[PDB]
Amino acid sequence: IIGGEFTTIENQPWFAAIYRRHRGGSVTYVCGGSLISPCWVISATHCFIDYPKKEDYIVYLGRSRLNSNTQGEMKFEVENLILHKDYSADTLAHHNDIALLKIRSKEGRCAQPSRTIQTISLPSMYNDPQFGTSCEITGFGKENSTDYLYPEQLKMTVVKLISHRECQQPHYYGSEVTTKMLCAADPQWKTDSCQGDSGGPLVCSLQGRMTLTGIVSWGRGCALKDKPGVYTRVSHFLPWIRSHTKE
């Protein structure tokens, strides 16, 4: 996250930190995610497409820091890794960038709600916030494009939803952005998501309720003018979500 402020999971209780186990013992951060139900975390396919082995992943809930523990945190294994079949990456655009992770602790249990571990509500069919609405993103991604390390503390920022008409302009993204995606940016172009934030949530207060409106997916650079962050439009994948979570 470029700009914004440091935060704690108590403020973003639905945030899930996904790491990958390496040959030896080193565990590195991969992507963000969101707990949509005690047993399910939703993230981005881009994060796992090159290493589809569910056994190599670890999911943390109630975690505020990258390489250090946080009391109340819970560690989970990935029972099932569901990648979207029609995922594809173009020059800039990442299509159907969405994934589901069924989690379970070593005792075979799912997440237990607490002050640091809470689920976020999914949107209603095709019901998205009006463009111009303020929403928040959270992640452990880069703070500057020139950084090669991720911040140690969770971050968050507020961005505004941009209409498809505006995001489809020539100087923005043109025809690369689709109706299955949502654009969001800071009117001042000072804050934005960046590498390492993929899979994280774009949360919007819709009708007095915190809703998982989007998933961090792609964008040209980070916090560059006329280049908004692009998010996977969750409301258009409800059938997909429901069909893979049932069983």
Ligand SMILES: N=C(N)Nc1ccc(CNC(=O)N[C@]23C[C@H]4C[C@H](C[C@H](C4)C2)C3)cc1
């Ligand atoms: N302008 C933006 N908001 N630009 C934007 C938007 C989304 C992203 C997120 N994209 C990523 O996190 N990329 C990866 C690319 C690969 C190495 C790591 C882990 C995953 C695979 C995801 C970083 C980047 C840049």
